[PDB]
Amino acid sequence: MLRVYHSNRLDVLEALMEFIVERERLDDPFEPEMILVQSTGMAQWLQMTLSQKFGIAANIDFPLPASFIWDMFVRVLPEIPKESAFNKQSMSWKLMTLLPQLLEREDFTLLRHYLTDDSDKRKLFQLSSKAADLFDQYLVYRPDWLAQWETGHLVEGLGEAQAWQAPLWKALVEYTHQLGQPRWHRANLYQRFIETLESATTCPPGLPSRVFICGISALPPVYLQALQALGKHIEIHLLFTNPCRYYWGDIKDPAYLAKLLTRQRRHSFEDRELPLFRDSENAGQLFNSDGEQDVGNPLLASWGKLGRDYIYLLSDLESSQELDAFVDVTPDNLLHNIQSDILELENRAVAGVNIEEFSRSDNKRPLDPLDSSITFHVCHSPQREVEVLHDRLLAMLEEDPTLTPRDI
Amino acid sequence: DTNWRSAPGMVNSVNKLFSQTDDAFMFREIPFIPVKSAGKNQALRFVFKGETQPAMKMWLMEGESCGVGDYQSTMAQVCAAQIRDWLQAGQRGEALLMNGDDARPVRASDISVLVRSRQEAAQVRDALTLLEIPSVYLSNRDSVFET
Amino acid sequence: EQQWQAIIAEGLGAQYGDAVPLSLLRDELAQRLDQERISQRFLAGPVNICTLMPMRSIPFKVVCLLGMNDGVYPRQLAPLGFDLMSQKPKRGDRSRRDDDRYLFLEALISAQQKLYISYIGRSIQDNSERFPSVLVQELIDYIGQSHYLPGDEALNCDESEARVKAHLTCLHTRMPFDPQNYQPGERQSYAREWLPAASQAGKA
Amino acid sequence: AELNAKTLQRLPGDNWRVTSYSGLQQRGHGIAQDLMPRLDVDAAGVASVV
Amino acid sequence: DVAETLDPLRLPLQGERLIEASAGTGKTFTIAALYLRLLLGLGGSAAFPRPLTVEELLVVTFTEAATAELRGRIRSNIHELRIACLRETTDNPLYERLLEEIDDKAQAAQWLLLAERQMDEAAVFTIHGFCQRMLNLNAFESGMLF
Amino acid sequence: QWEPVLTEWITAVLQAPLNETGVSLSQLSARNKQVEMEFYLPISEPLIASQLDTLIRQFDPLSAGCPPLEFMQVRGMLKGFIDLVFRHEGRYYLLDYKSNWLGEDSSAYTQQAMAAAMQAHRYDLQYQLYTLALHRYLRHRIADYDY
């Protein structure tokens, strides 16, 4: 099953991962425990965190998402070469032997001149790359675009450049064939992957036992689906650390809304969800046609832009089984207050829309001149700015003990 | 049309000067149209050892002839003198920048000497420094490496 | 030697016929070398000074942000212009703007006890004033709009707000030996080294 | 001049580090185990007329 | 010949206009004003076809410290005029003459909210920043290196 | 021109008899191999160089050459890479390929010479540490395992 865990702090999510491992002993024939991660930092944080609450951490693989998906392709599907022949690198080279021929086409007239005036394979190589770089990207965001261009078809609504990219892509694919290389990209292979998994409703061909996804606040639409289908024969524990407990994303059809009015189960107890019966969906939340016209908290509003997308795509899955793991934030600090707002999706900002509201000031929260969490410092220069910090780090170290330096 | 930021006495003096001849900026395409001084500033005035001083004051050297040499050794001296003159008379509350019925003693931070080149600056800095009046050349480019 | 072999093998893989001019390789060896980052000491001998890495939002008791100036933090770079995908966006898409802004949020979210925010207020030359990264502006602005100091309970929204932002904002001195750094109270320096000069206790 | 500088009453005490059979091998590997985490750190030197 | 005494709020926001900001005439107060008008498409006959976004109002100064201050002054004016839209009441010059020209204080407040959070991308560069920017975008035409 | 020597060198090491009954790299299939294992052994309660030298002595005849305790108190973790860990369907092992010497020829790679460089580089520690890790790991994985 593709289990999706929404938590407040990476700790609780690390906790659930800690427990998932103690529970099912997992096999042990040197079978590497798997954790998809997107930054060495995490890998190190997990490694150490886990070596503690266990006495050691040994195998664990930290494949990047993209490298995982393709790992499976090789497993599920029939005869897939390890490492695509369309990887960003090789692409740049193959594109360098091609472009020169593709010039003087009317199509590539724009590049045709850009590459003439002068060079020594300098302009040709940057292009061959920025190109290969783009293709590598289109192969994840808009993987249908290629299947289109491969047959010469264009796509209604794209800027120019498709004028040359489209042919170029068809051109790269044909060339790579003559070279005699596995035609398989990442786009012509995701659909099949799902189909053969979504069907063959029998059993897991021989993939891994359980898989985790830690600290990745974003994944491509296609990688999720790919994982979804995979989460039918494999246990996929995707640990997503979410800044708000309620749903703060946008909405599609006022028909898709009630399909969201479902519920997330506590990993151990049972069911929860967004506040105010209907009124919520109603009111302004997901107003007019747009998305959450209020997104409650204004900070989570203008910043979490990346979050919305990922949360919205997670709640558009079917084989999913999301569940709550949000821990509270008692509002004693300015930090905790703000942190709390963001959690409960509430705005405590006061604009003073009316003389009643605007004249008094005790409606807002009491500060506490003594509160030092969340401080602001204006300095004259980087040196100065660093000398000052060293002082305050010293201070706040003195302040409360227990605070070792690694905590900063 | 409105010149916020400045004193009426000033705007009047500047306008008068640049209204003398026609095409003061001598270029029919760059005409000079006077400007109305802002009301919120109508109160601005500068008093010294007695009464309010003119927005603009011209100091004229004597004689018939005058070399670029003289008109510097002597002008810097003069300028220098008038600065300490405002400053000292400032600590004694006799040099005041006033907005109607408000006031304050002029401080070094209030005086400013515009100049055309490094030298000129030095020329000034020296006559000043000769009167223990500390200064700083805001347009200094020298590097810490030839100190 | 690794990168060099890499760069070459890769080119051989895609079967490149024509020859290669050194420049090509040097310029690439350079770039790679420019991107290869060293961060092996990330979580051993404490106090980690680093950059805001996307997809690495670990929780720390203390979180300090330095150089959060306008034009400096929300790190930029404009899409190629011929990156079709950037003109016609979709839910899955990603860009630095978005990544960084959501990073600043991950900080606040991850700061368990103290959030330290710092930026440069003026260049030590023309002395002109600089500005805090909009992101930081959006934070104190929210603080001030939802808080009030004990004293000021009946005065005004804007007025109570100011006093709050002004109260959390701390204007530091140009030199470390400035006496203000040695009176009593808010961040008295822990550097006695400068004390004597701060107290004009010199002997010409 | 009525000043003075805060003086911290805490002490260094313990030191948390993450060693690795490096508590052995004396330095020189400074930044070495950093640039190449899997470098054959166990070897080093020059060669001649052999 | 001889220019019209400029009245910011009534300046026709449509093609070619030369403004002479004499010595300390509030050239900055003017620019900001004109900036807001544009954002909210205000004015009237002397207004602009439609409303523009922060990333559509190109402003070029010569100095680096210039664009910083210009960019700073604007985020502020926006945050205010926007607030002064939620209160539908302002008691500070400029702004009031602006709200009188606004037809839906509730919308401008929204429109403005975006302009606020958009400022970290305001099209306010230097002559030089504008150039290498257009250049590096239209690389093919300029024959520039990426 | 190193291929012959090398292609012949590799094999010679592969089909090389490890300890006794069978065991030779060439007999190890994928499923029984785990290359480059990275472990993390938490270490609380300061690890004193001296305190460890004592027990290391009693059990190891190699660490009898007691210069040790060349490091100082450390609390925290313990990184470490294991070149290879495999299983001869019965037990698990620790392999560490070590390319060293310039020490002329053969005579320097004798059971004596080797056990010499061992203390020379104090690799002995690597042993105890590494195994202590594989211990912790195997015990962790193999639900109910014995040394």
Ligand SMILES: [Ca+2]
């Ligand atoms: Ca080894």
